[PDB]
Design a protein around this ligand. Structure first.
Ligand SMILES: [Zn+2]
Ligand SMILES: [Zn+2]
Ligand SMILES: [Zn+2]
Ligand SMILES: [Zn+2]
Lengths: 238, 236, 234, 240
């Protein structure tokens, strides 16, 4: 009910239907979505937590305006937060079951690669990549860490598979997935070996793949900008 | 503005322990408690979810977040890691002449809190100026996204920079530890000026571990000090 | 002449012709290499600095014995030393000329690769990889750092290009990731991101350890193609 | 080795380089060096070569040796390398683990170092700290149980200015240096704590930061106390 309200409202913000700087109010938003006030209230609050809306001082909400600096900083925060989770898992240790689970996801991700450099199941990688980053966040067994890492990924343009959309299935991106999969293996290896410094460094570097993919799209493939939701609304971008 | 007296009153009742961890809150029962209308109560319950004091229940309603010792240790870790990011980015990107003069002035004022003997420290003066230093450090790299994320990491009562420095916890062991902490403040600024991001990050992370060291000293050696420290009311 | 004596002496140690525990003396070594004593003296001293020989009290050298732990530790030290050079270059800054030179090496390394990994210049990569690691060591402009980094890379089994016949499908695929690391080190140095520059340079040295561990577990016939590796007991 | 003519020449020749008797930039040849030490040609050749391996001399392209010259930049870079090498030993000890006996030994040195401090900020046994500080850094290098790593930290700490207690000589016992020892002792405690807790990242970061104290103390002598330069037996090698 409330979840269905979040999806539609998020879609209207990211499409540019509700532009940056636009003021949103409980009743006018409920009329727009043709949904009851209770789910709409949950949706507006959830999208504030997610970072798409800001609260206005006298009540109501405002659609946030993002710059390139915001995208780069969001990717940085996510990498730094995932690096913390990986380091703490290596320092504290991981349970037999949790390790078996994440190692199974890495093995499934290996099945997305073939003989030629381009032979990669892009859609299969993107779905399993989300699972790997979820399991990595929970690895150290801390709810506080899991919540803070998940919040850092909820943030705009900070999702692990955000720069891997189905329609951005290009050669240059498929070749870069082999290096990314080697990073997943290295994070788990470092955690097993109790090498916190390595686990953190690899997780931070791994997040920077998103920034490289973004920079590739601006300089070499600008038609791919519209494939990332909301990215074409960032006026700054170039 | 900003949720009014409703958000303030409801936050005060959660932090005092009046509304304990695990307690379920609903629109109507909360409105009866605050003797306010439904609209300002709905804003308050939503705002405190965004702030991280409440969690949403799957079938509607809210639940007061419960915190344990592990949560305090992890919050201090996240704060250090976030401050370390701000310090590293300030060193990598560079800092404006005005912003550097401001932070360096706070460090100079903090130096005036120290005397001849190891215990000769103005504890209340350090705590107030320490809050300013950490605020200024968060804004140094010039990024709003970083400043917001660092301030959020510092927002819980026990994750605050001066949280483990309350006026009544003015003990000898804690005054001796402030000299090392002040040397860390100087080192963070020096590393930023020198464009040494790695050092700036490492010092900021280590500096935050002082809070954990001071917390661990209480649990083991002075448990009567637990009640005096804010945030430790949300703990069991 | 002295450099020629070092190559010939190093080759006999790494082939196992001069086994570990063997005692070497100026005269007997000069008779063996059929070279004058002065270049042989330089060679014996240079190989002590490099870590292949140990000095005996009273003169004379002894050929060192190496274990897998020695290889693992050498690679660790090299990565840590290269990470220092990369971090200091990012923190201090690099001159326009030095940055153009190292970036030209990276561009030449790209020409070792095509569209596919089927035809990748393995011998070409190894030669240019040595140049990249030489320039990276000198980037921060410190002679002290350059000397300590080159020493850490002279060390046994620590060399950056640690294999003409060992040219398999897998080791060719791993050179693409290694080249992306070279690009990332330079990018981090340009961007003044010391932390990143250090982390990438450390992780880059670990590729050697990963490739060593692959041969032992999956391709032991490739052990004889690595110089001196066939002498270690594991 | 000290009893051999070869070993005796290394001790005497090292002493003349470190005293400044043989200054930086001085070309040393087999003959001139042998006349100086009044020793035969063969032990001199061993001596000259051993000090090149040691890093005190450099080889000249057309034959012969040159006394290696050191500048302020070289001292700063040497302290950086030592911190980076000690940080590696501390990180590897935390990652691998340390035996019960080795931990009890280093923790005993930390406890002995705590006995060097009193009530006032200046109340510090400077000579007692310097001797025990050498033991702590010795014990720290060996902690991970790797011989190559121990040797590598040993080498990084071998130049007279790259030594852990080099910037703590008996004659440089000043107020501004005694106050800095309290922070340094807290870092010794933090390195051991990080190793026990298996926190390699922290162990490395603290060991690197700890080494920067030596740079801070050096910079203080140059900018504020230049009369202290000559009384540090280790800064004699410095040109400018
Ligand atoms: Zn991933
Ligand atoms: Zn502080
Ligand atoms: Zn390379
Ligand atoms: Zn020390």
């Amino acid at each position: 009910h409330g979840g269905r309200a979040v999806i539609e409202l998020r879609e209207k913000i990211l499409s540019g239907e509700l532009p940056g700087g636009m003021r949103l109010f409980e009743v006018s938003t409920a009329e727009l979505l043709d949904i009851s006030r209770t789910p709409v209230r949950e949706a507006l609050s959830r999208l504030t937590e997610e970072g798409l809306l800001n609260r206005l001082p006298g009540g109501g909400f405002v659609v946030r305006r993002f710059g390139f600096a915001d995208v780069v900083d969001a990717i940085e925060v996510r990498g730094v937060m995932e690096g913390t989770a990986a380091r703490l898992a290596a320092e504290r240790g991981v349970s037999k079951v949790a390790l078996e689970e994440i190692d199974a996801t890495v093995q499934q991700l290996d099945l997305c690669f073939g003989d030629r450099v381009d032979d990669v199941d892009f859609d299969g990688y993107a779905a399993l990549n989300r699972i790997f980053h979820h399991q990595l966040a929970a690895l150290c067994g801390s709810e506080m860490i899991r919540r803070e890492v998940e919040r850092a990924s909820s943030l705009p343009f900070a999702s692990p598979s955000a720069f891997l959309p189905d329609k951005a299935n290009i050669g240059a991106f498929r070749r870069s997935l082999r290096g990314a999969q080697e990073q997943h293996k290295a994070i788990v290896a470092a955690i097993v070996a109790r090498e916190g410094a390595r686990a953190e460094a690899v997780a931070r570097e791994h997040s920077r793949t998103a920034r490289t993919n973004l920079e590739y799209m601006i300089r070499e493939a600008p038609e791919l900008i519209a494939q990332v939701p909301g990215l074409a609304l960032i006026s700054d971008h170039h």
